[PDB]
Design a protein around this motif. Structure first.
Motif, PDB file in Angstrom:
ATOM      1  N   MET A 145       0.818  -1.211   0.000  1.00 39.25           N
ATOM      2  CA  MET A 145       0.000   0.000   0.000  1.00 39.25           C
ATOM      3  C   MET A 145       0.846   1.252   0.000  1.00 39.25           C
ATOM      4  SD  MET A 145      -2.861  -1.435   2.754  1.00 39.25           S
ATOM      5  CE  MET A 145      -3.940  -0.054   2.698  1.00 39.25           C
ATOM      6  N   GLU A 146       0.180   2.358  -0.282  1.00 40.05           N
ATOM      7  CA  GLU A 146       0.755   3.707  -0.240  1.00 40.05           C
ATOM      8  C   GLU A 146       1.192   3.896   1.196  1.00 40.05           C
ATOM      9  OE1 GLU A 146      -1.281   7.914  -1.921  1.00 40.05           O
ATOM     10  OE2 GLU A 146      -2.469   6.294  -1.086  1.00 40.05           O
ATOM     11  N   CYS A 147       2.237   4.683   1.410  1.00 41.43           N
ATOM     12  CA  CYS A 147       2.667   5.008   2.753  1.00 41.43           C
ATOM     13  C   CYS A 147       2.599   6.497   2.905  1.00 41.43           C
ATOM     14  CB  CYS A 147       4.099   4.539   2.986  1.00 41.43           C
ATOM     15  SG  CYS A 147       4.628   4.725   4.703  1.00 41.43           S
ATOM     16  N   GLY A 148       1.729   6.976   3.781  1.00 44.67           N
ATOM     17  CA  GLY A 148       1.649   8.410   4.051  1.00 44.67           C
ATOM     18  C   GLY A 148       2.708   8.880   5.036  1.00 44.67           C
ATOM     19  N   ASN A 149       2.607  10.147   5.434  1.00 41.08           N
ATOM     20  CA  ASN A 149       3.541  10.803   6.338  1.00 41.08           C
ATOM     21  C   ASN A 149       3.221  10.574   7.817  1.00 41.08           C
ATOM     22  OD1 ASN A 149       5.134  12.731   4.364  1.00 41.08           O
ATOM     23  ND2 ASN A 149       2.973  13.034   3.843  1.00 41.08           N
ATOM     24  N   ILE A 150       1.929  10.598   8.131  1.00 44.26           N
ATOM     25  CA  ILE A 150       1.422  10.580   9.498  1.00 44.26           C
ATOM     26  C   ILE A 150      -0.098  10.521   9.370  1.00 44.26           C
ATOM     27  CG2 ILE A 150       1.128  13.098   9.593  1.00 44.26           C
ATOM     28  CD1 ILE A 150       2.147  12.952  12.587  1.00 44.26           C
ATOM     29  N   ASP A 151      -0.782   9.995  10.370  1.00 45.22           N
ATOM     30  CA  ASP A 151      -2.223   9.980  10.371  1.00 45.22           C
ATOM     31  C   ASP A 151      -2.698  11.289  10.928  1.00 45.22           C
ATOM     32  OD1 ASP A 151      -1.275   8.871  13.110  1.00 45.22           O
ATOM     33  OD2 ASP A 151      -3.371   9.405  13.475  1.00 45.22           O
ATOM     34  N   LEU A 152      -3.958  11.598  10.691  1.00 40.57           N
ATOM     35  CA  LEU A 152      -4.489  12.873  11.063  1.00 40.57           C
ATOM     36  C   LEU A 152      -4.533  13.047  12.558  1.00 40.57           C
ATOM     37  CD1 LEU A 152      -5.604  15.535  10.113  1.00 40.57           C
ATOM     38  CD2 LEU A 152      -7.865  14.478  10.134  1.00 40.57           C
ATOM     39  N   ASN A 153      -4.861  11.986  13.282  1.00 36.82           N
ATOM     40  CA  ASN A 153      -4.969  12.091  14.730  1.00 36.82           C
ATOM     41  C   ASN A 153      -3.630  12.449  15.350  1.00 36.82           C
ATOM     42  OD1 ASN A 153      -6.852  11.795  16.994  1.00 36.82           O
ATOM     43  ND2 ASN A 153      -5.494  10.132  17.618  1.00 36.82           N
ATOM     44  N   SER A 154      -2.577  11.723  14.978  1.00 36.36           N
ATOM     45  CA  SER A 154      -1.238  12.001  15.520  1.00 36.36           C
ATOM     46  C   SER A 154      -0.863  13.435  15.189  1.00 36.36           C
ATOM     47  CB  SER A 154      -0.187  11.083  14.926  1.00 36.36           C
ATOM     48  OG  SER A 154      -0.469   9.720  15.162  1.00 36.36           O
ATOM     49  N   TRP A 155      -1.213  13.832  13.969  1.00 34.67           N
ATOM     50  CA  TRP A 155      -0.837  15.118  13.477  1.00 34.67           C
ATOM     51  C   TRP A 155      -1.554  16.216  14.244  1.00 34.67           C
ATOM     52  CZ3 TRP A 155      -3.351  19.042  10.574  1.00 34.67           C
ATOM     53  CH2 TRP A 155      -2.481  20.008  10.054  1.00 34.67           C
ATOM     54  N   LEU A 156      -2.840  16.021  14.518  1.00 31.13           N
ATOM     55  CA  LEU A 156      -3.615  17.038  15.214  1.00 31.13           C
ATOM     56  C   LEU A 156      -3.074  17.239  16.614  1.00 31.13           C
ATOM     57  CD1 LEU A 156      -7.323  16.448  14.141  1.00 31.13           C
ATOM     58  CD2 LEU A 156      -5.825  18.402  13.550  1.00 31.13           C
ATOM     59  N   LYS A 157      -2.753  16.148  17.297  1.00 26.72           N
ATOM     60  CA  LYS A 157      -2.158  16.241  18.639  1.00 26.72           C
ATOM     61  C   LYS A 157      -0.817  17.004  18.658  1.00 26.72           C
ATOM     62  N   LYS A 158      -0.030  16.904  17.586  1.00 24.82           N
ATOM     63  CA  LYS A 158       1.302  17.547  17.521  1.00 24.82           C
ATOM     64  C   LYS A 158       1.216  19.038  17.162  1.00 24.82           C
ATOM     65  N   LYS A 159       0.078  19.481  16.632  1.00 18.62           N
ATOM     66  CA  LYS A 159       0.039  20.744  15.892  1.00 18.62           C
ATOM     67  C   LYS A 159      -0.127  21.996  16.765  1.00 18.62           C
ATOM     68  CE  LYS A 159       0.985  22.219  11.946  1.00 18.62           C
ATOM     69  NZ  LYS A 159       0.062  23.189  11.251  1.00 18.62           N
ATOM     70  N   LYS A 160       0.715  23.006  16.519  1.00 20.58           N
ATOM     71  CA  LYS A 160       0.511  24.340  17.093  1.00 20.58           C
ATOM     72  C   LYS A 160      -0.888  24.843  16.680  1.00 20.58           C
ATOM     73  N   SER A 161      -1.074  25.185  15.398  1.00 19.48           N
ATOM     74  CA  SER A 161      -2.401  25.555  14.845  1.00 19.48           C
ATOM     75  C   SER A 161      -2.452  25.301  13.334  1.00 19.48           C
ATOM     76  CB  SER A 161      -2.743  27.018  15.146  1.00 19.48           C
ATOM     77  OG  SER A 161      -1.970  27.906  14.360  1.00 19.48           O
ATOM     78  N   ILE A 162      -3.657  25.312  12.759  1.00 23.42           N
ATOM     79  CA  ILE A 162      -3.873  24.921  11.346  1.00 23.42           C
ATOM     80  C   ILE A 162      -4.085  26.135  10.432  1.00 23.42           C
ATOM     81  CG2 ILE A 162      -5.368  23.658   9.762  1.00 23.42           C
ATOM     82  CD1 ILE A 162      -4.818  22.751  13.506  1.00 23.42           C
ATOM     83  N   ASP A 163      -3.452  26.142   9.253  1.00 26.46           N
ATOM     84  CA  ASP A 163      -3.672  27.246   8.292  1.00 26.46           C
ATOM     85  C   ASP A 163      -5.052  27.052   7.599  1.00 26.46           C
ATOM     86  OD1 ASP A 163      -0.817  26.332   8.631  1.00 26.46           O
ATOM     87  OD2 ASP A 163      -0.318  28.316   7.854  1.00 26.46           O
TER      88      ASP A 163
END
Ligand SMILES: COc1cc(N2CCC(O)CC2)ccc1Nc1ncc2c(n1)N(C1CCCC1)CCC(=O)N2C
Ligand SMILES: COc1cc(N2CCC(O)CC2)ccc1Nc1ncc2c(n1)N(C1CCCC1)CCC(=O)N2C
Ligand SMILES: COc1cc(N2CCC(O)CC2)ccc1Nc1ncc2c(n1)N(C1CCCC1)CCC(=O)N2C
Ligand SMILES: COc1cc(N2CCC(O)CC2)ccc1Nc1ncc2c(n1)N(C1CCCC1)CCC(=O)N2C
Ligand SMILES: [Mg+2]
Ligand SMILES: [Mg+2]
Ligand SMILES: [Mg+2]
Ligand SMILES: [Mg+2]
Ligand SMILES: [Mg+2]
Ligand SMILES: [Mg+2]
Lengths: 263, 263, 263, 263
Positions: free
Chosen positions: B88-106
């Motif tokens: 399968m395709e391999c992404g960078n990170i899942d959305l959940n992990s990413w949301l927890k890491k994020k300062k804020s979203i553009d």
């Protein structure tokens, strides 16, 4: 989420692997979606001595390519007054991180990693480099094979996180405070191999540092070498960890030793 | 350190990304040293219902490829009575992990991720799937674009480490304890977009679960929607989070909304 | 580093043990250098319903003192429009933290902790309280004996750090979305005792919550009860975890059971 | 959960605070439910030199009680061929743990802690002890006042968890590899005060140790002392960190300095 240009070719960044100051290492992909590393140095604040230090490494790293594949490969670089970008091989994990994670080591893999280490250090020695500060962090596991990395002047490289530093120091380097020689790397390598053999460095048990420093230089501190099934392994370690560098085994000697030469 | 064969082609494993039972996902490289993922399921203990569940996914995953690139791609698979391997395709990170890491979203990235989510869920809806349990973990960031993943029957997939689960549940699914419809995914998506808007899910503040479950079904619990610069954003969230599924906005409606259609 | 005055007497704070909103619990020492806890509630933002809730607890906590020593003791309190300070017994650790830390439980200690739990819950029942949300966090280990804590209306208390929430929910409380009774605490207690028996709650294995909620209410989901040396233990758990609250065992029944009555 | 007998009196253990080998420290309560610490040493494997070392400490710890309350108090002890138990004062936290946790230090508290440190070290000096390895871990915050701890021969004491070591080394102690004097503790103390002043030790920035060791002994490595509002503070640090121990300020000198003497 980002990308970078080195010598015309575009690379997309997967993740930051590690950093120092003012350096960072990235795991990246090229236009053919193939995996590489890029080391980035920010020069905005570098003094002459430091500039020279980074130039020396890039130069040696270039020269040593031709003579051994147990030094990390550099493929291309861009260098300005503002920045360095170096495109490089990307290994799996460094030896230090790996050793900390490991249940135990297969004797075959240990011996094989030992051969790689010897070849690498032997190589830098033939080109007039004497590292003098070798440690597990100085080796990168790439496709089952260790390659020397971060072997340059001021290289404080450390892995990053998403949330010993003296156990390897050779005795002659302590006493010296004109007296550092190739033999000093033999000590350090021995300490790494001792670790891979006994799960611990020869003075990991001494946690106070005045006391640990003392123990490294003190000949009436017998280092322990419990018997193991591999007697050759036992003799290599014993010969590497002789405190009198003159009576310590040499790299060309170690390459003729039965441990590395007999199956 | 290892390798695997799927349909003749050899893949070398870089690292384990995640797992469930009896599933594991790996980041691997192919013979051309290109980056992919491989999902491995151990069938040694799977009952009929579960076997069927894994067959259904592979089948849908195959069919949905043709109709949208916002579903994770499957390239090839090997399936026996003992194991499944899916390349399968391999992404960078899942959305959940990413949301927890994020300062804020553009705002641009939020809107763009919103479009991808709508397209994906719209797609499964056209093929008779109604997920009913959508969450940030169900989306994978691949080259700046979210793709639906882990959307099958029993999919307890979680990231691995080298050392909410109810905030998205739609009200009709609670009351129902013949009553789950497409609208339920609209709720869940709204909750994700609310998160991306306000840094928090509508009931992240209520930590007791009897109390949180109660609040989701209770119409005299006014959900808060502080004014923001994007009024369209504000109306989408308000329409997604209407408790009466009949009065809730539909996916085909949401795709015509000014938030997604006007620059 | 600090200190506080409750009803004339001065207390010096050792450390913050835990908090909620707008509550905090401290481990403190009195003028005789003896160890107590102080719960601090900041009322600056409390609405009527919440004010009333904190008043109710202090009142019940006062009344229940006289009737059982398996409810945390309150010694004194100061209450104004601005703040509450309650001086209280300080235990060793809460049951939840303790269960997570534990290798395994000695059958004698389990049985003894079971007796304490029954007595406490039996007590609140005699005074017209039906908790309906009991969990390991609701018990404090004080001198080898469990005492009920944090049993009041809105009590989101959690330990602090220097750096399940649904596994106990009774089925009738789910279906109810006039139908919560004393029997509901029997369920919850049973789940705790099941944990202390089998190292796991009856549905710790089901990690998706729609699926876990479903399983709790579903009678064709046979809960497992592997045979153990203590047959009485086995029957108590079986009787506590009957889904039909009418056919579930009562607290006065459980206090007559051989498990608690026969040595 | 447990208890212990020292000289007839029973103590119940609250928690293990820390350990070394074969030592452990506990926070305990006496029969009057008052808070103390108990240090436990297991002698089952101690050699003569080590036995003697633990005897020396207990003896000094006893003698020094009378002459200063900035040495941790020992109240009673039991000592056999098998074990030592020492009942002692229990502080709040050690200085090292505290410094790592701290936002920033109030100038008054810094100065006050400085006075305590001087008094303690001055005291051991008057009784013929020269520590030579002082560090933040050697001080315990007890009721707002630092007291010297763990100051004995082989004392590898470290806090426990429920889940630098060279920045203080004086230069003369390095060169010495008949040359350690009282002045060496002045260095170390200066390094602690420097930390409390600048948030960092003078060579915390140099992470390689060969390089850090070199920097401590090297007089052409000017240590930095950014101007601050407290000029006295600035001069004390400058005088403590003079590399030539003969030109370094003495403890009796430091006690007459305006920094400690003028309000
Ligand atoms: C995914 O690739 C890697 C992952 C890790 N880790 C995974 C995280 C875990 O906590 C331990 C570290 C460590 C090393 C690599 N591979 C790798 N390749 C090239 C270089 C390099 N490192 N590093 C790493 C930077 C920190 C240590 C080695 C420096 C040497 C170098 O010039 N290059 C280009
Ligand atoms: C390096 O690639 C990834 C890294 C991460 N993480 C980095 C570690 C951090 O703690 C958060 C998780 C998360 C996801 C990916 N990429 C990725 N690609 C494909 C799949 C997949 N995931 N996963 C991940 C397994 C756990 C969550 C998603 C499941 C979906 C799937 O079928 N495949 C093939
Ligand atoms: C040292 O005393 C304690 C330590 C701990 N922990 C040690 C840290 C570890 O991570 C787990 C929690 C937990 C509980 C106590 N003792 C204790 N006494 C009274 C109350 C109380 N708790 N707490 C704790 C606050 C968070 C959970 C229980 C609330 C109940 C109450 O009204 N009072 C006064
Ligand atoms: C609650 O009491 C304490 C807590 C802490 N910590 C809380 C945990 C956090 O991670 C940092 C350490 C640290 C020190 C104390 N108090 C304390 N009193 C007496 C001694 C002592 N320590 N210790 C501690 C053991 C490890 C460091 C100091 C050794 C000195 C000694 O002889 N005694 C009797
Ligand atoms: Mg890490
Ligand atoms: Mg981590
Ligand atoms: Mg992680
Ligand atoms: Mg904790
Ligand atoms: Mg800690
Ligand atoms: Mg911790």
């Amino acid at each position: 989420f980002q990308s970078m240009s080195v010598k015309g070719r575009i690379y997309s960044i997967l993740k930051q692997i590690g950093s120092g100051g003012s350096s960072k290492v990235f795991q990246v992909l090229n236009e053919k979606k193939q995996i590489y590393a890029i080391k980035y140095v920010n020069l905005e604040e570098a003094d002459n001595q430091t500039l020279d230090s980074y130039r020396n490494e890039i130069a040696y790293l270039n020269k040593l390519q031709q003579h051994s594949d147990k030094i990390i490969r550099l493929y291309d670089y861009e260098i300005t007054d503002q920045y360095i970008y170096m495109v490089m091989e990307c290994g799996n994990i460094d030896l230090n991180s790996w050793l900390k994670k490991k249940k135990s080591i297969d004797p075959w893999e240990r011996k094989s990693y030992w051969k790689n280490m010897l070849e690498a250090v032997h190589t830098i020695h033939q080109h007039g480099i004497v590292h003098s500060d070798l440690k597990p962090a100085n080796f990168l596991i790439v496709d089952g094979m260790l390659k020397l990395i971060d072997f340059g002047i001021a290289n404080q490289m450390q892995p990053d996180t998403t949330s010993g530093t003296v156990n390897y120091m050779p005795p002659e380097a302590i006493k010296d405070m004109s007296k550092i020689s190739p033999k000093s790397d033999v000590w350090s390598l021995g300490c790494i191999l001792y670790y891979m053999t006994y799960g611990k460095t020869p003075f990991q048990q001494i946690i106070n540092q005045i006391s640990k420093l003392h123990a490294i230089i003190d000949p009436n501190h017998e280092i322990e070498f419990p018997d193991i099934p591999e007697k050759d392994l036992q003799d290599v370690l014993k010969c590497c960890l002789k405190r009198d560098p003159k009576q310590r085994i040499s790299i060309p000697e170690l390459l003729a030793h039965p441990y590395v030469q007999i199956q």
